[PDB]
Amino acid sequence: SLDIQSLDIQCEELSDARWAELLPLLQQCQVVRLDDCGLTEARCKDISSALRVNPALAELNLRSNELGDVGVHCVLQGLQTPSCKIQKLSLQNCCLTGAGCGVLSSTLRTLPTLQELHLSDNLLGDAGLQLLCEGLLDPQCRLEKLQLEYCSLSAASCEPLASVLRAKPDFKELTVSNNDINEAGVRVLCQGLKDSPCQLEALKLESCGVTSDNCRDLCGIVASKASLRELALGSNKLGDVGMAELCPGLLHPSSRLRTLWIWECGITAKGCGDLCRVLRAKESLKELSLAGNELGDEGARLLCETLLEPGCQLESLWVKSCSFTAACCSHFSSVLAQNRFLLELQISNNRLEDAGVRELCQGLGQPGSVLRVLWLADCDVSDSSCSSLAATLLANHSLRELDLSNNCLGDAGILQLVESVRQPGCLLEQLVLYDIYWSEEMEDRLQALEKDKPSLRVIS
Amino acid sequence: SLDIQSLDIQCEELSDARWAELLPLLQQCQVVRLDDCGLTEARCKDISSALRVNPALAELNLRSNELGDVGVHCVLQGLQTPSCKIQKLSLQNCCLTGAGCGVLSSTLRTLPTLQELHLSDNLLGDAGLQLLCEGLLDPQCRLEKLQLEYCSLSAASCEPLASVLRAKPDFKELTVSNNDINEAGVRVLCQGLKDSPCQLEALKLESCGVTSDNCRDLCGIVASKASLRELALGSNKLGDVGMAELCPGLLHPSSRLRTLWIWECGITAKGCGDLCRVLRAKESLKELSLAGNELGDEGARLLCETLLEPGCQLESLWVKSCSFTAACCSHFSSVLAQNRFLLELQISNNRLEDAGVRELCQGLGQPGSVLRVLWLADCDVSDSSCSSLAATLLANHSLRELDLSNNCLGDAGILQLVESVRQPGCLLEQLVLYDIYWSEEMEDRLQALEKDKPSLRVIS
Amino acid sequence: ESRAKKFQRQHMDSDSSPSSSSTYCNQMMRRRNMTQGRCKPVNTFVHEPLVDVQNVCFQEKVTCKNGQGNCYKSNSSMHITDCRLTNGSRYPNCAYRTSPKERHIIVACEGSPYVPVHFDASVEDS
Amino acid sequence: ESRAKKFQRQHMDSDSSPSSSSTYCNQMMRRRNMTQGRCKPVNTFVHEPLVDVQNVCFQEKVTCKNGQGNCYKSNSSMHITDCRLTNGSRYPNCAYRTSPKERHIIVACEGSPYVPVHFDASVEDS
């Protein structure tokens, strides 16, 4: 037999009646998420008791509830039933402090089935974290995924975490984003990974004060973990030099990184030449974000040349707010009409104007094009280039999602888009139009299109 | 605020109190699956009313029940409410007949939100299918995926179905495997497919009496539908001549097929060599299943040579029951040690013997291996492999699943594998040991292993 | 949902303190259903009584960004909070930067009774 | 779950018709819990009262497939149905080949009582 139940409530005030009504589910569900449900320390006692009798629970998510240090304590006590098998557990944004880490530390030593922990959005501080690390070092701790974003951790937390990485051959992912662990801490965490036999799968250290020189530390990491799939280093003034010293690792034959997150890292056109060398060489690199980098029209030219050459197999290019202009659009049009690997192009917050957008539409409108997702939010688009978009939606049949949110679009422009998507021949499945001003007529006209074709979601 | 909920009860006996205690869930669940739970026709009305008030029903799966035509109609009325957002329906093997299809057809005319529909394993017969296609033709029908396996259809029901593909500009899946559509039938469908503007993704015609000539009709599909990702043709007498005729399609510029399922297709090394031309040319092919075909060692060699040259990015190879012997294992072994794309090899039921299994291990054990899953079931494996299968589980660090089912292994050899996987450093995630006998003592050791290392599942 | 309640949902939070915290946007954008299917890129909440935001519909007339002749700018700089999507956000993990401030608002109003039907922009003229 | 009970659930179906139709295995394998997870490749159900199968542990001793010695071959042929995974199968969709026939069976035995804890094979000697 097989009985699997799941409940996942989010942002809902729960009455007492309704609460007792859900308690039987807490005793029965393998998957429970009460995200921002107003849970109180008090109510953490019903959960404690209910989970104590749930021989099924495998995933518990209590994100964004004021559980406090006492509440979390009551919830952790509920996981002490001998037959519990919780594999995932999130306590993100639960008002947990260093004063609660002792309890959690002594709790982790007794949950060998527990594999994932999210402590992000809590003020743990170095003492609490260091105290937890002691629990994690227990051989009974089989944690493989840990997220500590925004945990008030500084450089004084990396040696403790490095020791944990050394003690977990089974480790898969660590996230330390939004913690100023500085250049040394970053150098210390990477030291652990190097020694550690754990085949890391994803490393995230965004907004961590990662420095240019650290781009050398990370080099050793990329050129050492064939298992590494995701590397997130956004929001760090890495630099073009930083980019340069990363390539030796990426360009390593054994590197098989699939996702590289480098939005707002102090990269320009020169750093592009550096990344293009990696793109054209590594068919393993599929997703790339350079959002918020001053690539300029010269950066897009460089990226576009490589996207037009055999080799690079990039699938998603995220280049929103990169400071591109219409001058660099004739190239993307070609790629959208000559590329058979790119399915998504986030090119928001770029002054492409109607001239640039129209060029993009020309390439996607070419038979053979394959692009699936296009993001053109805040690209200074108006009704001008709207007829094109309307025809492109009838000519090209690969696009499934189009984002035109936050532009100048008019009622005459939308009407044109509508006259195209309302048709059975347009296969667009999702249109997103946040922050746009149409008439009360258009609204109903839009609300009609809904019912006439429910397979197309118009998000606004 | 969201309140996503789901319930899945497979093969279970439910008392009156358990059923009574389930209904509230049928009024709130986004996904409802009640598979082989002895559902009664009368219990249908209870299902209908309950669903009538559900404000978010997306998936309704009632797999295997004797609902009968009457029962079916009941549940259907529950969905025919002003406010229904149903997207997928499963009534596979629920006793619906042609008679009960007249109502089903008309019901299908009023559910524009419905995207999928599973009617397989129901004696619909040709009259019913055509009686059903009347509704499918209604422009208010927006169905994109349809499965009709084992529906008692012949070539006749093939023109009516042909009428739907032509009518649906965005039809996604047509599964008609396990009916006798035969040569004449397969031809009718293909004409309709190319006679349609649909960007179809998957097409299934296994065990359909597909012939060698029919392969000239399919060649027109692969070339015409550039959006095609799945083409299943197993259990059809395509032969080498058939396999050869498909190629021109598999080699058409716009074809980027992802999974070619052609098990037991009367193909030999000759047709295998033809397919390898397509493999080396399309890095897009990801899943190939040539199981049950008498490929022999030559075919095993043609594949390995292909898996050791550019392009070809296939990720999973299914070559079980292919008549391979140890005389081809040095080859595959070299692929495991040198190939960086293949992640899952199914080579069960091939006379590899202990000698063959040792070679493979030599290849996998090499530094820089990427294989994640291995199936070596019923391939003459014994204790003289375990010491080696142990050396692999430690020298290799990518394998996550290893299936050694139905092999003459002794608790001695099994102890060797244990010594490896027991180690926190052994990255293995799932060991499959079906039909393997061992004492109560080893049973004890394995039941304890299964407790002391819950990240590793030892299926039996 | 009418062309007025959605404004309250997407842009109204009257009784919320002005000095928003670093959880506000991540919290409010979630509670007000602006991160369903897709993360709403930018959104502004107004810390003023509905009647105060409603009067702008009769305050200074101005042109909307799109170019339609019928927008309005408030008389006083209202206490608002801007929510900005981080360039590291990946649905459904929408992430926002919360920015509280005092600025005049520019909304579009339509119908009868005449009411706000779109939050157009905020202005720093003080 | 005792090894004896596992043997029942996996290999005993005493109360079923011998000439099972091709619908049988797809039915039985799923209901007896041999598909949830990874499809079971080859299994065998015996159409005989439990006492007849238990009686085999007292009949002809033979070598077990894995070399162990406590296997027994029934002195007579019995009604069985073999289920084998069809190559079109792809978890969770686990379909089967149904071969209901009459053969001698071989099982391993152990414990107190001394009963079947493993189906080792079937023999065709007539």
Curated annotation (Swiss-Prot), chains A, B:
GO cellular component labels? angiogenin-PRI complex; cytoplasm; cytosol; extracellular exosome; lamellipodium; nucleoplasm; nucleus; plasma membrane
Q: Which residues carry this modification: Phosphothreonine?
A: 81
For this chain, one GO molecular function annotation is:
ribonuclease inhibitor activity
Region (2 X 5 AA tandem repeats of S-L-D-I-Q): which ranges?
1-10
Q: Which pairs are disulfide-linked?
A: none
List residues modified as N-acetylserine. Answer: 1
Q: Does the keyword Acetylation apply?
A: yes
Q: What is this protein called?
A: Ribonuclease inhibitor
From Swiss-Prot, chains C, D:
Summarize the PTM comment: N-linked glycans are of complex type.
Alphabetically ordered keywords of this record = Disulfide bond, Endonuclease, Glycoprotein, Hydrolase, Lyase, Nuclease, Secreted, Signal
Glycosylation: which residues? 33, 75, 87
Name the residues that bind substrate: 6, 9, 40-44, 65, 84
A Gene Ontology biological process in which this protein takes part is: defense response to Gram-positive bacterium
Top class in the EC scheme:
lyase
Q: How changing residue 87 to A affects the protein?
A: Substantially decreases binding affinity for RNH1 but maintains high conformational stability
Q: How does it assemble?
A: Monomer. Interacts with and forms tight 1:1 complexes with RNH1. Dimerization of two such complexes may occur. Interaction with RNH1 inhibits this protein.
Protein's job: Endonuclease that catalyzes the cleavage of RNA on the 3' side of pyrimidine nucleotides. Acts on single-stranded and double-stranded RNA.
> What is this protein's name?
Ribonuclease pancreatic
* Provenance organism: Homo sapiens
Designated gene of the protein? RNASE1
